[PDB]
Amino acid sequence: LTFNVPSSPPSNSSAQLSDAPVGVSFEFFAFPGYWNDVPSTSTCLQNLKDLSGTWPPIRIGGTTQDRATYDASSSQQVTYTVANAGDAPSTLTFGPSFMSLAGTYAGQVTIGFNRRLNNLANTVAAASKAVNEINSLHAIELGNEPNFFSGSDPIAQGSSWTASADYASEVTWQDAVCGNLSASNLISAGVFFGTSPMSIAGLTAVEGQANSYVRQYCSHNYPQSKSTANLANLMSHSGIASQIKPFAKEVAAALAKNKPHVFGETNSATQGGGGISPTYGAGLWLLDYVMQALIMGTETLYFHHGTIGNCQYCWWGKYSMGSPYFGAYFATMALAGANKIAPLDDQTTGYAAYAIYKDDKPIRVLLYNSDYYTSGSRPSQTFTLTGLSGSTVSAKRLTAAASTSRVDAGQSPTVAGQTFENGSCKIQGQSTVESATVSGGKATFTLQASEALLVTL
Numbered sequence: 138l139t140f141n142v143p144s145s146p147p148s149n150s151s152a153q154l155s156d157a158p159v160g161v162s163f164e165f166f167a168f169p170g171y172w173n174d175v176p177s178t179s180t181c182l183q184n185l186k187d188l189s190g191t192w193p194p195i196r197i198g199g200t201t202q203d204r205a206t207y208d209a210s211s212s213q214q215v216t217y218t219v220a221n222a223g224d225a226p227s228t229l230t231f232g233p234s235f236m237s238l239a240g241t242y243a244g245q246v247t248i249g250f251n252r253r254l255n256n257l258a259n260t261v262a263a264a265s266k267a268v269n270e271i272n273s274l275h276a277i278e279l280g281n282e283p284n285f286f287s288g289s290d291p292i293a294q295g296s297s298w299t300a301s302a303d304y305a306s307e308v309t310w311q312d313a314v315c316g317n318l319s320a321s322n323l324i325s326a327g328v329f330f331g332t333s334p335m336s337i338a339g340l341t342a343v344e345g346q347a348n349s350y351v352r353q354y355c356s357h358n359y360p361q362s363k364s365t366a367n368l369a370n371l372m373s374h375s376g377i378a379s380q381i382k383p384f385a386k387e388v389a390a391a392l393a394k395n396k397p398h399v400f401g402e403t404n405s406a407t408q409g410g411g412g413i414s415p416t417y418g419a420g421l422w423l424l425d426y427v428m429q430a431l432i433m434g435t436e437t438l439y440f441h442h443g444t445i446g447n448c449q450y451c452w453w454g455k456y457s458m459g460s461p462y463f464g465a466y467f468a469t470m471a472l473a474g475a476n477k478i479a480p481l482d483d484q485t486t487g488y489a490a491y492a493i494y495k496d497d498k499p500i501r502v503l504l505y506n507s508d509y510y511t512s513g514s515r516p517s518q519t520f521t522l523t524g525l526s527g528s529t530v531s532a533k534r535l536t537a538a539a540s541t542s543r544v545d546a547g548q549s550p551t552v553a554g555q556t557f558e559n560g561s562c563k564i565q566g567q568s569t570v571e572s573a574t575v576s577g578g579k580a581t582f583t584l585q586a587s588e589a590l591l592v593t594l
């Protein structure tokens with residue numbers, strides 16, 4: 138395997154990147170718990186800001202945003218009952234202090250409010266409070282995954298809930314919210330799970346002048362369920378290229394409206410994740426997915442964090458770190474301060490190489506070996522880079538014992554030999570940097586199955 142590193146961005150490069158493409162989504166009812174009850178939240182976010190110079194953007198939403206009513210006279214951030222701490226509530230209220238708490242975050246904040254219950258005046262009042270309380274407010278969603286609403290939901294108003302019904306609903310709600318707030322460029326529109334039966338392509342065709350009310354168009358993506366869980370398939374480099382392809386039309390539809398696309402809620406697998414979601418391989422999926430989604434043209438990805446103590450795809454909890462945090466950390470490291478990324482491979486194999494540009498000059502190369510590995514002799518692949526300078530380059534390696542390695546089982550992955558403390562997210566260990574010879578502008582690297590390597594030029 139040999140890849141030429143071009144001296145300026147290739148034609149199949151990404152567009153200019155955001156300052157911090159890797160963000161975090163927090164299930165709406167659990168957001169105060171993440172801030173108040175989970176010590177690792179602050180440090181895990183600070184660790185990423187320390188790499189990029191920008192707070193990861195955050196989003197607060199999910200199914201529970203459509204179970205929630207704003208209570209302007211509540212002094213509580215969030216009020217609900219569950220039978221077990223592991224359950225999500227069937228209903229909840231949130232006070233104005235919920236938005237104030239989100240307003241303590243310095244990074245860009247997206248907040249999702251309720252459209253399913255058709256409480257339009259209540260959602261307008263929550264939106265007004267969000268604008269007042271959240272200085273770094275990026276966007277407001279009006280409903281989460283309206284593709285899953287039914288004729289039984291208040292928003293359907295006793296008629297069938299079709300794609301056309303939702304698009305018409307979104308324009309009406311965008312008009313009422315922006316009209317009441319005298320605002321524009323505010324709504325995170327669509328918020329669809331996948332691309333059928335509702336699509337950004339379909340919504341943008343109907344938006345017309347209400348496009349002016351839209352900040353961004355939003356997709357959700359979860360490649361697998363508990364029932365289709367297959368870690369080798371999830372993390373496969375060529376598999377990821379196939380998996381994201383339906384969203385290419387969604388990105389194109391948003392960008393034709395001069396509005397960004399985001400994956401405003403995404404993670405490995407649904408119902409909070411399956412046996413594959415806490416693995417090292419799910420962190421490698423996350424790493425490679427981020428790179429491919431940004432080249433496709435999405436602006437930002439927000440990885441979902443669900444019920445505290447019952448969340449398989451979470452990067453951290455109250456007590457343990459999760460292997461997937463290593464993918465988010467490495468992706469953030471790879472992209473830090475970069476303007477563009479370009480795929481050097483053709484995405485037909487398990488092996489990836491990306492050139493990473495700053496000021497139109499190559500600064501880093503990210504290599505990825507997506508081969509699934511659990512037992513026996515671990516295979517490896519050599520990667521040759523051409524077109525380089527000097528007599529030597531440096532590299533940092535992401536590795537673990539197996540594709541299935543879990544931090545909570547004691548098999549943490551390492552990022553240049555470092556790990557993150559259980560219960561705090563503090564960085565731990567001695568960093569180790571590798572070096573390689575450059576002769577005649579070529580250097581060779583070896584990646585075992587299920588590894589990634591960030592080469593600094």
Ligand SMILES: C[C@@H]1O[C@@H](O[C@H]2[C@H](O)[C@@H](O)[C@@H](O)O[C@@H]2C(=O)O)[C@H](O)[C@H](O)[C@H]1O
Nearest residue numbers: 415451452453454455456457458459545
């Ligand atoms: C799946 C895992 O859940 C959370 O970690 C658990 C861990 O599995 C358990 O053994 C114990 O240590 O409690 C922690 C916790 O609740 O923090 C955590 O969300 C982690 O990121 C996940 O991978």
Ligand SMILES: C[C@@H]1O[C@@H](O[C@H]2[C@H](O)[C@@H](O)[C@H](O)O[C@@H]2C(=O)O)[C@H](O)[C@H](O)[C@H]1O
Nearest residue numbers: 164199200201225407408409410443444
């Ligand atoms: C209530 C919530 O349910 C799951 O999270 C959902 C998420 O709310 C939804 O927007 C997305 O399509 O699917 C997620 C998923 O199935 O994982 C999780 O079980 C959460 O932990 C829980 O809080």
Ligand SMILES: *[C@@H]1O[C@H](CO)[C@@H](O)[C@H](O)[C@H]1NC(C)=O
Nearest residue numbers: 257258261312313314316317
């Ligand atoms: C404001 O919101 C209400 C819904 O509570 C709606 O009836 C009204 O038309 C909206 N006003 C403007 C100016 O958009």
Ligand SMILES: *[C@@H]1O[C@H](CO)[C@@H](O)[C@H](O)[C@H]1NC(C)=O
Nearest residue numbers: 147148149480481482483484
């Ligand atoms: C990107 O373009 C390069 C040539 O500049 C090519 O070798 C590579 O296969 C392309 N990758 C993709 C995924 O289009």
Ligand SMILES: *[C@H]1O[C@H](CO)[C@@H](O)[C@H](O)[C@@H]1O
Nearest residue numbers: 517519520581582583584
């Ligand atoms: C990666 O390391 C292998 C040894 O396993 C070499 O063949 C290669 O040239 C590079 O140093």
